Amino acid sequence: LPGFATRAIHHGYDPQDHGGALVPPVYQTATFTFPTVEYGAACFAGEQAGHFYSRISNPTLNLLEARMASLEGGEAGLALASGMGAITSTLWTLLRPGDEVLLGNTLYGCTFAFLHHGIGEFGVKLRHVDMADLQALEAAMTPATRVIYFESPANPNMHMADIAGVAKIARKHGATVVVDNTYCTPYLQRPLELGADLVVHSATKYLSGHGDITAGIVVGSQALVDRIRLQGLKDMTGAVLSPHDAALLMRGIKTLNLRMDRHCANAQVLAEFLARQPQVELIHYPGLASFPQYTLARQQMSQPGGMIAFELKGGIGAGRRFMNALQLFSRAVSLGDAESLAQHPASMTHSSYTPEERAHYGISEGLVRLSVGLEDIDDLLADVQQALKASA
Amino acid sequence: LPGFATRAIHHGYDPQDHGGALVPPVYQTATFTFPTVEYGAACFAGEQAGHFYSRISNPTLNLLEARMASLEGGEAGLALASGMGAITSTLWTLLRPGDEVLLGNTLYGCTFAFLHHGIGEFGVKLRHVDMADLQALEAAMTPATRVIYFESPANPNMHMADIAGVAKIARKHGATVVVDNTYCTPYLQRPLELGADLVVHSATKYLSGHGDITAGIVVGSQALVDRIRLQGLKDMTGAVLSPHDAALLMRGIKTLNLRMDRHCANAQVLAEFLARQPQVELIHYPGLASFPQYTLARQQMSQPGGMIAFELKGGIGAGRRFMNALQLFSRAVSLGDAESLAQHPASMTHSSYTPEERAHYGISEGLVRLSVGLEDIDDLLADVQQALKASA
Amino acid sequence: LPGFATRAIHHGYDPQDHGGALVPPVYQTATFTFPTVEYGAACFAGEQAGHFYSRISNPTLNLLEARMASLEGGEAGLALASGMGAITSTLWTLLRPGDEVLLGNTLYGCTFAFLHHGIGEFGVKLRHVDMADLQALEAAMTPATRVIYFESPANPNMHMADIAGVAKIARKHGATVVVDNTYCTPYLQRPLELGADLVVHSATKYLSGHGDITAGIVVGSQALVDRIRLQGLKDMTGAVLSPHDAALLMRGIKTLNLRMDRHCANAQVLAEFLARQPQVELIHYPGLASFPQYTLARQQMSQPGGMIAFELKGGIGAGRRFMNALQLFSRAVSLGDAESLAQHPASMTHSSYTPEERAHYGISEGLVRLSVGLEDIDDLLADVQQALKASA
Amino acid sequence: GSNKLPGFATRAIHHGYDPQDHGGALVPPVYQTATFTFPTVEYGAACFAGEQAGHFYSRISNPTLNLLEARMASLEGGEAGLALASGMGAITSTLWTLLRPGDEVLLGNTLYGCTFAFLHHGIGEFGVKLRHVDMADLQALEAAMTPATRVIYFESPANPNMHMADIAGVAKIARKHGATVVVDNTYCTPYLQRPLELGADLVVHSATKYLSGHGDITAGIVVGSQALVDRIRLQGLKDMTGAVLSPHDAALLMRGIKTLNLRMDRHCANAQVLAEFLARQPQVELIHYPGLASFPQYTLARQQMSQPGGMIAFELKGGIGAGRRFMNALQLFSRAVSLGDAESLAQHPASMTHSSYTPEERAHYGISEGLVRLSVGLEDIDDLLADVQQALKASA
């Protein structure tokens, strides 16, 4: 098997099958035609191949898919118009009313919304567990329980779950495990190899790596992905990825290894820096010894990630000011671009709410999140340094 | 009030406001930054115009939306990654278990699937009612009924709906009337102007006009679209349209009027031609006097349209013979491309079936369906001429 | 022989050939590979159809070029980065020091510049001649005369050349004739059918039709074109056309006929309105009976075009006032966009000069020039109308 | 202190752009528009007259391009930038503006094929006098200066042998006699070498290669002083070539440059291992890579380039026919001519670009019989090793 970046650059494509084009051409085209009609017949049946319409299949998309399936080690892949396109398409297909789904204690906000105000409102039962508490997960299992869905690492503190510990419990009761692997990418973590059934990415972030597209990827077994292709996508969301945008994603995937390597080194220096600063009460970075799941981290992820969460002594007012002072970093929700981003949920994403509500939904007053980019490290240090002083 | 063509080209944009750029610049960006947290706090409650994410707002996206709002004469618009993306994003937000949805008697296949196999399996009641029959409709109006949805003209026979009459009833019961106006486009039929509440399109078809993008649009009230944006799109579909594809869609719309005029002028020659032919048994062209609903159709459509359906003697065997013998028309599903397309569902989409089954879905054995392109008519004429000779 | 519109849409491509894709895929690739070194040996002599590098050959560009050949009724077509690209690539190939070029009396500014300030300065001799005057042409030929280059109709007064007469005079001395056929497009005029050897285009204008690309075309004889490819393009300008932009261009070409009809019709009307107005000294529009060379116009052009020029009685000040009152028309150079455009060279392009220098060059103090767009005629009228009022 | 220059990667990603000047957009919007409009007829008269800042036409100027230009400038350490449709675009546009008949251009000994062709079969034929000199030999260069010498042009490293030139040594000679020094800097990118900081007047790239890095666009760049870049803008490109870059492709090129440091660091690490490996293999008669001591101009290479590059050339034992066999056994390297892509590429000019020719004829255009050239891409080094190991075995 070739190495990750050989595959992130070659897998699935031989130049010869398309006139020697080194870069595969872009199929920007809604429909495909048929030479006869019996031949058309046998593509709403599936013995001939060739795809029929761009909301089901497309070679540009199919290559993005095969390529991502190889990076995750899984059998098939599906591309969609966004992360949420991947998450919603997934669950709409796998769940019906009366099914229970078991959710990690904290989720990407729009995931939480899709659950508690979306599919949750159509007779599907929700329950939150701490996926790190294998005792407590077991306890919470039922036979109605059809799905376990978490992010590891998860917002806000980078709380991790033992993926293989969780698969074991799923194997025993007969439930399907879906891991949102956005933060890590296949380059760092690979849940299917630890017994997860599906993985979902917002390809909008690290995979594209250049903040210019919105996209998502499902990877798993042919059997399940085919279901998601043919029900969740075709019929239930219509989250279709543009062939233009899929080729952009494929282009940013060629440098994934190189970018992630730099994301993780930058982050580490920045983490170690932050821990030594007076204005900081708590830091959450997977690559610190101080991280409470440090061992689990090293076991499951090959590097500690580009993301840092940390908490400012003077609370929400101290984070308002830290955030306003940033000159090189940008204020934006989102992550995994070459440009360094930061957000202070207390006074951005979650503003009106007063403090108990913030805690109740697990969000500290002074908590900042950084997506550490590909900039020069002394430059980032300096922007953060001065912004810490401004926090006072 | 500027003309329809003026507006298709200019509505919502001034070059003086963007450095003098004649064509708007394309905002191929997944995220926007904030000047302060407080500015960004405002962006999640709602009170600061501009933008948060590409999944909610983006100027390229907004332009299209506004512009599509203006053509249909609606308060506000919304763009999504496909037709299905619009249909699902709308229905999802307007229905919850124990609600009902009344529907035309025949729907676009994937709309059908979604209803029966998707949302209708989470406890939403479905009923099919012939929407040209106000008696039959007012009858089905239980008090549960929350949404009335249909296509006019509708597959296969271009069956029309009394839009004004359906709206009257719905306004009476507090129902929302939702129209898929994909086939006409606002140049030819503005359902909101007949008391529709919402319209949806596959922009994949006529609006793009060029078979190179997949995309969808919703138009209607501020209140209904704010809802569909922030729940259906935001959490239940994740169907985000590429700003590149949004630009190419805008490009398309700049010739909707010229394109539709030729679509309609070609369609009508071929339809008149067909009517004088021995191999054709019956035709469904809105523009022929003998059309069962010639008069309701002119009330609602400025022109008879670009689609033709007809039935061949020799039934199914004839079809294949016809279909396979074309060399200008292409065999494909889809419609509203510059390229003329033909399909005969008995031996294509619904081939796996058997005639006894094909009765169930109202699909005749000799029904071929022309989407008439922009090519010189004499060529389209000759092509169809020899393909009928070959149907002996 | 398939009609223009059928060719503009289909020529050079069969979906079957490329896995059914209705719209050919876009070859955004800079290099091409080889299966063996033997097949690699072939693409540096060239007795095979393939490619070696996008800067000499690429399928998307070739398709475009085939499609332009067919419409201009020529053997071979070349695609380039801009019209200037095509013009200079063409001339740099066919002229060497001591060679002479006869030119139309007036030319597009940068073409004039290229000649007088570029190539002319490398020992190429230049002579300007009126090309309706066949006696003066015959009398200006010298053995040094190698090329005859002109636009027709030509700025600023829409002055025609007698193309077929020229080509006859040219035949006598074996000289090559080159026609900037930008203004008419192969849809209105076909110089090669009137004996010219080569036509060039600024595809930036009518061919794109929508103002989003820069692009040039050469069409003519296989041997001439091959040399412009291999020398002008490859070695001397390197104005390589983006595959993306070539795709958008072919997208444009699909509605060329329809757009051209609307352009010409809007124009015809505006010219009638203009000719009869109190403020208007003079008017140059081909379609008016009073246009000097009306009879020749109609021998060459199937329609009078979308361009108008007129002179305001009150000179520079009227133009200056007339230009700023416009709300729908945009002030800008350029032409053939869907948006209507205007410019008053006297106070814009040639504003630096003083009055007697602009007469010395052929520029009236109230000459205004309109690119009649695709907007509603009544709206364009209203704009012009009020700007005419305001010019007093 | 705030008068520190941001690091190279910071600038390759941020320079010249602030999201707040454009709606918060984190990525600049693409100005995919062929022309720009004026608020009054007066404001239009300024941008043809020089007075008020603004845009008239994308073939003269465009904000997407402008940002690309200001960014490449910063990276080369030049005053101004220009973006063109191709490498050759940049070069021809340059020389067509800098040279007239009777002017003399001094050229390095070897050149890129199309550049060689431009000069010998193009501008050379329009009354411009050419002379080739070993740019590595400053005595010989001083010796060739005339008062007619107007431009000194050369690549460094040079196609195809990566022959190096003393850039500083040249600009000093050129300062003395008064000439303009244009350096083709495609093979290094500004990340490894910056001729403008060593005294050159202008640099030109084929951005089609390393700057893009993903081999899907065609593009050129000129960087130099404001006046010379302006001239080239308004004479070479505007009137003489029309080599305008599509804003879409320019947006892609900026996307490429956001990773340039990383990619180059990986091309170079990869190439250094491959070269070391190659030197030790039996069939390899000789090898030419800047990062080995056996490189003739090893010290000047180190002097001038912060890393030895991604290009390797070497000669097999067995003449042409051993190449045929080697190249046709490559399963991961592609058979192509080009460089700077993430895909690794191998050309064997003997049996490819120069296949028409007969052995003898090669030696008098300069090319060995068993000469393979390599653009080492970004693949995993261990796959690239294995590919070359097994291909050598077939070339036995």
Which DSSP string corresponds to A118-170?
Answer: IGGGGT-EEEEE-TT-HHHHHHH--SSEEEEEEESSBTTTTB---HHHHHHHH
> Which spans in A32-82 are helix H?
38-41, 59-72
Residue D16's alpha-carbon distances to A212, B305, D31, in angstroms, are 18, 51, 16
- Sheet of A125-129: strand order equals A76-80, A216-220, A198-202, A176-180, A145-151, A100-104, A125-129
Q: Does A166 touch chain B (CB under 8 A)?
A: no
Write out the residue limits of the CATH 3.40.640.10 domain(s) in chain D.
Answer: 6-260
Sorted by sequence, the CB contacts under 8 Å of residue D191 that are 6+ apart come out as D8, D75, D260, D261, D264, D306
Give the number of C-alpha atoms closer than 13 A to the C-alpha of residue C80, restricted to the C-beta side: 34
Query: In chain D, what are the helix, strand and coil shares in percent, each to the nearest 5?
Result: 40, 15, 40
Nearest CA in chain D to A379: D6
Sorted by sequence, the CB contacts under 8 Å of residue D15 that are 6+ apart come out as D6, D70, D71, D74, D75
Mutation for B interface: A233, A235, A321, A351, most B CBs within 10 A = A235
Residue D225's alpha-carbon distances to B306, C262, D76, D145, D197, in angstroms, are 59, 48, 11, 23, 12
Q: Is B232 helix (H, G, I), strand (E, B) or coil?
A: helix
- Closest Cβ opposite residue A26 in set C16, C26, C35: C26
CA-based Rg of chain A, rounded to a whole angstrom? 22
Terminal Cα distance for chain B, rounded:
54
- B142 has binding-site annotation: no
Q: Which chains touch C (3 or more CB pairs under 8 A)?
A: A, B, D
Length of chain C in residues, anyone?
392
Of residues D150, D209, D233, D266, which has the active-site annotation?
D209
Strands of chain C, DSSP E: 76-80, 100-104, 125-129, 145-151, 176-180, 198-202, 216-220, 280-284, 307-312, 330-331, 341-343, 367-371
- B302 has binding-site annotation: no
> Pairing mode, if any, of strands C76-80 and C216-220?
antiparallel
Q: How many secondary structure helices (H) and strands (E) does chain C include? A: 14, 12
Architecture of domain D6-260: 3-Layer(aba) Sandwich (3.40)
> Which spans in B276-376 are helix H?
294-300, 315-324, 355-360
Residue B278's alpha-carbon distances to B281, B282, B382, B385, D79, in angstroms, are 8, 10, 16, 11, 77
Question: Does B238 sit within 8 Å of A86, measured CB to CB?
Answer: yes
Residue C201's alpha-carbon distances to A20, A164, A374, C183, C216, in angstroms, are 31, 64, 44, 8, 6
Mutation for D interface: C37, C180, C324, C353, most D CBs within 10 A = C37
Residue C84 tokens read as 């200037």
Residue D172 tokens read as 């000093």
Do C169 and C141 contact (CB within 8 A), yes or no? yes
CA dihedral sign of residues A278, A283, A286, A289: positive
Architecture of domain B257-390: Alpha-Beta Complex (3.90)
Q: Facing residues of C199 across strands?
A: C179, C219
Cα–Cα distance, B178 to D15 (Å, whole number): 49
Do B321 and B391 contact (CB within 8 A), yes or no? yes
Cα–Cα distance, C136 to B237 (Å, whole number): 72
Cα–Cα distance, A386 to A103 (Å, whole number): 39
Is residue B183 part of the annotated active site? The answer reads no
Task: Return the active site residues of A.
Answer: 55, 108, 180, 205
> Cβ–Cβ contacts within 10 Å for residue A127, how many?
11
Evaluate the omega torsion of the peptide bond into residue C153 and state whether it is cis, within 30 degrees of 0. Answer: yes
- A83 has binding-site annotation: yes
Among the listed residues A373, A376, A380, A367, the one whose alpha carbon sits nearest the alpha carbon of residue A306: A373
**DSSP state, A336?**
-
Evaluate the omega torsion of the peptide bond into residue D157 and state whether it is cis, within 30 degrees of 0. Answer: yes
Q: Is D353 helix (H, G, I), strand (E, B) or coil?
A: coil
Do A150 and A115 contact (CB within 8 A), yes or no? no
What is the experimental resolution, given in Å to one decimal place? 2.4
Residue C59 tokens read as 């399928």
Of residues C99, C108, C125, C262, which has the active-site annotation?
C108
Question: Does B254 sit within 8 Å of C3, measured CB to CB?
Answer: no
Residue C11 tokens read as 């020529």
* CB-count burial class (<10 Å; 0-12, 13-18, 19+) for D124: middle
Is residue D112 part of the annotated active site? The answer reads yes
Do D272 and D148 contact (CB within 8 A), yes or no? no
Cα–Cα distance, D256 to D253 (Å, whole number): 5
Q: Which H or E run contains D345?
A: strand D345-347
> Which spans in C83-228 are helix H?
83-94, 109-113, 134-138, 163-172, 222-227
Among the listed residues C58, A245, C66, C210, the one whose alpha carbon sits nearest the alpha carbon of residue D86: C58
Question: Does D336 sit within 8 Å of A9, measured CB to CB?
Answer: no
Cα–Cα distance, C293 to D251 (Å, whole number): 47
Fold category of A2-256 in CATH: Aspartate Aminotransferase; domain 2 (3.40.640)
Q: Is D125 helix (H, G, I), strand (E, B) or coil?
A: helix
Annotated binding site of D for pyridoxal 5'-phosphate: 57-59, 87-88, 206-208
- A242 has binding-site annotation: no
Cα–Cα distance, C324 to C316 (Å, whole number): 13
Residue C376 tokens read as 């509603």
Q: Is C372 helix (H, G, I), strand (E, B) or coil?
A: coil
Cα three-residue angle D7-D11-D12, rounded to 5 degrees = 115
Which position has the token pair 């949806």? B200
- Closest Cβ opposite residue D263 in set A22, A255, A337: A255
Write out the residue limits of the CATH 3.40.640.10 domain(s) in chain B.
Answer: 2-256
Residue type, C216: G
Among the listed residues C376, C75, C79, C380, the one whose alpha carbon sits nearest the alpha carbon of residue C252: C79
CA dihedral sign of residues A186, A192, A193, A195: positive
Cα–Cα distance, C165 to C175 (Å, whole number): 13
Sorted by sequence, the CB contacts under 8 Å of residue C278 that are 6+ apart come out as none
Residue A281's alpha-carbon distances to A125, A312, D67, D375, in angstroms, are 37, 6, 41, 50
> Cβ–Cβ contacts within 10 Å for residue A352, how many?
8
Evaluate the omega torsion of the peptide bond into residue D160 and state whether it is cis, within 30 degrees of 0. Answer: yes
CA-based Rg of chain C, rounded to a whole angstrom? 22
> Cβ–Cβ contacts within 10 Å for residue D245, how many?
35
Cα–Cα distance, B10 to B21 (Å, whole number): 13
Q: How far is CA D77 from the centre of its chain?
A: 16
Backbone angles phi, psi at A165, to 5 degrees: -60, -40
Q: Facing residues of D132 across strands?
A: D107
CA dihedral sign of residues D12, D17, D22, D23: positive
Q: Which H or E run contains D334?
A: strand D334-335
Compute the count of residue pairs across chains A and C with CB atoms less than 8 Å apart.
70
Q: Is D303 helix (H, G, I), strand (E, B) or coil?
A: helix
Q: Facing residues of D129 across strands?
A: D104
- C55 has binding-site annotation: yes
Do B173 and B152 contact (CB within 8 A), yes or no? no
Do A50 and C20 contact (CB within 8 A), yes or no? yes
Within chain D, what is the greatest distance between any pair of CA atoms?
A: 75
Cα–Cα distance, B385 to B369 (Å, whole number): 15
Residue C223's alpha-carbon distances to C50, C76, C148, in angstroms, are 18, 9, 18
Is residue D258 part of the annotated active site? The answer reads no
Question: Does A83 sit within 8 Å of B351, measured CB to CB?
Answer: no
Do B88 and B102 contact (CB within 8 A), yes or no? no
Fold category of D261-394 in CATH: Aspartate Aminotransferase, domain 1 (3.90.1150)
Give the number of C-alpha atoms closer than 13 A to the C-alpha of residue D209, restricted to the C-beta side: 27
Q: Is C88 helix (H, G, I), strand (E, B) or coil?
A: helix
Strands of A203-293, DSSP E: 216-220, 280-284
Q: Which chains touch B (3 or more CB pairs under 8 A)?
A: A, C, D
Residue D367's alpha-carbon distances to B76, D161, D164, in angstroms, are 68, 10, 18
CA dihedral A378, A384, A385, A388 (to 10 degrees): -170
Cα–Cα distance, A74 to A70 (Å, whole number): 6
Is residue C180 part of the annotated active site? The answer reads yes
- C203 has binding-site annotation: yes
Write out the residue limits of the CATH 3.90.1150.10 domain(s) in chain B.
Answer: 257-390
> Which spans in chain B are helix H?
4-10, 37-45, 59-72, 83-94, 109-113, 134-140, 163-173, 222-227, 243-253, 256-275, 294-300, 315-324, 355-360, 377-389
Do C82 and C239 contact (CB within 8 A), yes or no? yes
- Closest Cβ opposite residue A25 in set C26, C30, C31: C26
Evaluate the omega torsion of the peptide bond into residue B153 and state whether it is cis, within 30 degrees of 0. Answer: yes
- A108 has binding-site annotation: yes
Residue A311 tokens read as 């908490």
Nearest CA in chain D to C216: D242
Q: Is A219 helix (H, G, I), strand (E, B) or coil?
A: strand
* Cβ-count burial B72-104 (b if 16+ within 10 Å, e if not): bebebbbbbbbbbbbbbbbbbbbbeeeebbbbb
Residue D88 tokens read as 């050759």
Residue D224's alpha-carbon distances to B245, D69, D229, in angstroms, are 37, 11, 6
Sorted by sequence, the CB contacts under 8 Å of residue D151 that are 6+ apart come out as D95, D98, D99, D103, D105, D106, D179, D180, D181, D182
Q: Does B3 touch chain C (CB under 8 A)?
A: yes
Sorted by sequence, the CB contacts under 8 Å of residue D116 that are 6+ apart come out as none
Q: How far is CA C226 from the centre of its chain?
A: 21
Residue A77's alpha-carbon distances to A68, A187, A216, A219, in angstroms, are 6, 16, 10, 4
Question: Does A212 sit within 8 Å of D255, measured CB to CB?
Answer: yes
Among the listed residues B258, B266, B277, B271, the one whose alpha carbon sits nearest the alpha carbon of residue B369: B271
> Cβ–Cβ contacts within 10 Å for residue B17, how many?
9
Which position has the token pair 């074996």? C174
Cα–Cα distance, D241 to D244 (Å, whole number): 8
- Closest Cβ opposite residue B59 in set D23, D33, D64: D23
Q: Which H or E run contains A223?
A: helix A222-227
Nearest chain A Cα distance for residue B299, angstroms:
32
Give the number of C-alpha atoms closer than 13 A to the C-alpha of residue C284, restricted to the C-beta side: 20
Q: Does D19 touch chain B (CB under 8 A)?
A: yes
Q: Facing residues of B200 across strands?
A: B180, B218
> Cβ–Cβ contacts within 10 Å for residue D306, how many?
12
> Cβ–Cβ contacts within 10 Å for residue A212, how many?
28
